Amino acid sequence: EKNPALRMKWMMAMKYPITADKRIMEMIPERNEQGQTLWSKTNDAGSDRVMVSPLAVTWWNRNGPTTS
Amino acid sequence: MDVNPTLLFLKVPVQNAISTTFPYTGDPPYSHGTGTGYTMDTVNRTHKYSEKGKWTTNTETGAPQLNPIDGPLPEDNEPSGYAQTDCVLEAMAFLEESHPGIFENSCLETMEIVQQTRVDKLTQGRQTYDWTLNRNQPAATALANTIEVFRSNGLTANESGRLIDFLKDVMDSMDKEEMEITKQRLNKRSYLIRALTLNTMTKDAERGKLKRRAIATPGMQIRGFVYFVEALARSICEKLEQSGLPVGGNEKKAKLANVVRKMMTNSQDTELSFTITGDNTKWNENQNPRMFLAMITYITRNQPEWFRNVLSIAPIMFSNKMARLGKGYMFESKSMKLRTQVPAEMLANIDLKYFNKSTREKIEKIRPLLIDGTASLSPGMMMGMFNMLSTVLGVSILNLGQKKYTKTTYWWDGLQSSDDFALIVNAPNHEGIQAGVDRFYRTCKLVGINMSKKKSYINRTGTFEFTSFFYRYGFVANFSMELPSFGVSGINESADMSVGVTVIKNNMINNDLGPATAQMALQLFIKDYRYTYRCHRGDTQIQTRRAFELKKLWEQTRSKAGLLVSDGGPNLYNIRNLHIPEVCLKWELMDEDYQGRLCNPMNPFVSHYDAVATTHSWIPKR
Amino acid sequence: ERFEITGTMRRLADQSLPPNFSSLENFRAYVDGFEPNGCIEGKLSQMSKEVNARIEPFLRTTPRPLRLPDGPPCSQRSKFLLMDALKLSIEDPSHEGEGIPLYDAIKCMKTFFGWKEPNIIKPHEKGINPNYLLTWKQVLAELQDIENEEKIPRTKNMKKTSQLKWALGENMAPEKVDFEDCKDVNDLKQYDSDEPEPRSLACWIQSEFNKACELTDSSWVELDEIGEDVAPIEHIASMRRNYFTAEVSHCRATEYIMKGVYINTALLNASCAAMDDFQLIPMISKCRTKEGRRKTNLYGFIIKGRSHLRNDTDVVNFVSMEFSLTDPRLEPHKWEKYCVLEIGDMLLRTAVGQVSRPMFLYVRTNGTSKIKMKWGMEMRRCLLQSLQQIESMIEAESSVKEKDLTKEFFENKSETWPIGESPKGVEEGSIGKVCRTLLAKSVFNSLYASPQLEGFSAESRKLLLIVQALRDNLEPGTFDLEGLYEAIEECLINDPWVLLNASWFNSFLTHALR
Amino acid sequence: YSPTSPSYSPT
RNA sequence: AGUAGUAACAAG
Ligand SMILES: [Mg+2]
Known part of the structure; x- marks a missing residue:
């Protein structure tokens, strides 16, 4: 459907709804310590990017690079 | 006991609980098919x-x-x-x-x-x-x-x-x-x-x-x-x-008292004042x-x-x-089980025995105007956008209400905005009140202004309505004239917040959303937001995919208040906050190593309303 | 700076002038040198004296009751049952987020062991009655078929059987052909655009609304927290809100608000993804008990037909199979569009003996649209409007005293508000009842939304305001009172909700003019 | 007994 | 059938 709200809800329900640069695969691990998969090897059809789960965002914010 | 909300108005003045006569919670009346028939009515x-x-x-x-x-x-x-x-x-x-x-x-x-x-x-x-x-x-x-x-x-x-x-x-x-x-x-x-x-x-x-x-x-x-x-x-x-x-509405509220003052404070004890709750047809x-x-x-x-x-x-x-006429008409064959959309151009040259007795009448009357299958409308202003210039005219008659231009015992002032108006008539006696009302109504008819007798009424000055502002002895409405969805906006965690929070602020300033109502709007927004982005507060037992990740972040963080709602943080917003970006609002409260990641421009999520650049500002798949 | 009216444009401009001004520059001259001279004064003395605004005096005697239409009693058009619905329930001490509805439903279904051989009771007048009974049997069967399947499905798409192909309207529309290939046809007339068939006010729409204002034993809404009350207004705001959210928390209308959202949301999602699948959508709501434990409820099942929606107006057909204890033969006019089965017996052991009521199923072919579903999902704004109505009512009554009357409004524990009517006359209720009533109204305004209502509300408001001006002793007068009525009554056709809102107006008017 | 949500099994 | 109401949807 054309409505963005509805679309977003549908999107977030999928495993990997977020687009991010291939570099993420070096920075963060593929699996969280409970086993939850954070990013996928599936390449983006448009740019040099890969498919990523919202868990990745949260993971970066608790384990990630502290720059002042 | 059988319940009847309408019985409130026995205790409550209608102006006070007028908010209760508006059914703007279900879907609105949408027109199905083709409004080609509805145009020909407007032309005819x-x-x-x-x-x-x-x-x-x-x-x-x-x-x-x-x-x-x-x-x-x-x-x-x-x-x-x-x-x-x-x-x-x-x-x-x-x-x-x-x-x-x-x-x-x-x-x-x-x-x-x-x-x-x-x-x-x-x-x-x-x-x-x-x-x-x-x-x-x-x-x-x-x-x-x-x-x-x-x-x-x-x-x-x-x-x-x-x-x-x-x-x-x-x-x-x-x-x-x-x-x-x-x-x-x-x-x-x-x-x-x-x-x-x-x-x-x-x-x-x-x-x-x-x-x-x-x-x-x-x-x-x-x-x-x-x-x-x-x-x-x-x-x-x-x-x-x-x-x-x-x-x-800020100035429009004042404008009602502004005008009522003029007609009441001037008037001595021997002077009637009747306000007509007006509308032109x-x-x-x-x-x-x-x-x-x-x-x-x-x-x-x-x-x-x-x-x-x-x-x-x-x-x-x-x-x-x-x-232009429109999309056209549809025809249904009861015997053969067929349907067909006849484009509006063909209404010019087509059998009249296909249409019904009322729809045939309109097709006949408009035909003499059909050039290039597009009916001409030299008179009228079929939804023209001369809303302002049409107000200039309307006002110019209210202007003719001064004792100077009437040269009689009776006089009038009012408010105009396109078709909607509100008029106060002052006179010494009831005959003068009527004569003044007639004077205006006829002076309007001379400039093609036709007051609706059905959708208007007159009463002693004190209670009236103008553009849906219900006045009662100085008090004006103060409720919300159309409510938007206070749900997720459909952009990203960081954006949706800054949008949805501001939406509520704007309604409080412009539309007159009540404070308590604004808080419930906020409450509902946060509910939808947390549900959509699986970012339920870190101390909740709720189970999503993101649950564990947020739970861990919550456990590690010293200054909980610091965390964004997007990171399982608590909602710190309220009526006074609805104009501060969440990151700004929660800047001082954040853990150093937290914002050091949240704001780290070396993040993979961003490529590189008041938006704050964070790891939440990601882009959805398309 | 220059800007000149060109050849083609001048020739237009000259035709667009008042009569007998054959040139623009001619006309401009008249205007430029125009000095007014009693033109209006003269044309007024000239004009007909038939043209005027004669003031009909509005007296306690002048207003008659509204003209409610005569005919057959109005039927139930609500998408799901309200006062008649029945729930198969389970406890949910898992604190689970969006738990798979299919399994919640099955777990619910397994709690009941009183199923019978289904037999039709009140048959749908214009429908293939045996198709409905077959559909329920197919539903019953296909839910067992899951149990003996190598894997478990997340969602059940029903087999496109003879019965389901009929109930959802599979290939029941005429085929679209170009005008050239069917121009010379014998009965090729335009679509029927008749008046809606006029129906009379049934007694049940009131009975439905009475139960909407009822309190329940369960908490039906859970709203999230906000920041600490600091600013002065924020204290008043959270005072007003917390009081209201207390009276409304347990109200039955709130159950309907969730029920509508939970159905419409799921229906609209399935409408998009499973366009060609006959998806089984179970009707589920979740709530907290008197004790506090989480509780999942099943009202019945909805099979969605083919959902190819391009326009917001374009319709999706479905079948509402809903559990109920209500015997349909009590008020069979209400269930005009429904085919009611007897699908089991329930046993309730009460303190006055062993009660054995029978379990019905209100099966019905229905439709909805993207717009109608979208506005079903946004039903929670019923709470916002409901609260707005109270907040505005307080804001007003407070402004005369110039002192916030919030705490006074709610803490005043004395039944003062005229809200209902018994044979005794007008009955007074509490602010709590007011809140729930004002919510229920706002909910039924959403459930039974209709141009009839939209219009009636708009026009009746005018008469209502006039009536108040009389009670204020403000010598009210109308111009065309009859005209106003004709415009009001024009909307009173066949909508139970509208007809009731009209009945209510009459009820009020009676006591208003006394 | 509540006709909307009545208890039909014992515990 | 059903939604719907002054014309549409009951897929193309
Ligand atoms: Mg008006």
């Missing part, structure tokens, strides 16, 4: 209120043009299209008198606006009609097509950047004997039928109406001038006190474009000839306008 009604005018045949167009102005002074209480020039000019004249220089100055401030305005301003519009495609298109897309087809037909005065210089291309386009679309070439006769076009669709999402209505949208030729017309009208309406436009269909030309030309007395011409064009175009 418009030509009925103007029946006794003079029929002309246009030199360029060959359209049967009806002109009801200076027509037979009405003999019944029906809707009259017969406005009198001498009366409209007198009204304008007596305005310039009561407000010295009002036209002089407006013209000067509008000339500046003409010499500044960029073609860019046209893109900021509704679903316009693109003559380039003969289709309803976005305002930006319709202009880009027009400028391109104009560039390829030897017209690049728009290249300068000014709108005035584009409007010259519109003037010069009328002369060119062939116009070619990138490849289809049409003659000058068939081009002018596109330039003077109002495309028609039924109005969806209209409340307080059983049967659907026929709205109309103009071409990208007229658009440009109407803006400049409405700029002048605005410049005047700003200088007029009885005008309810273009001001907000068939407003659009009963104001003739030639009267707006008549107005403009009077306003632009002693002004440069170029300026007069620019403003004069809109009403001339509107006076020779042609209204």
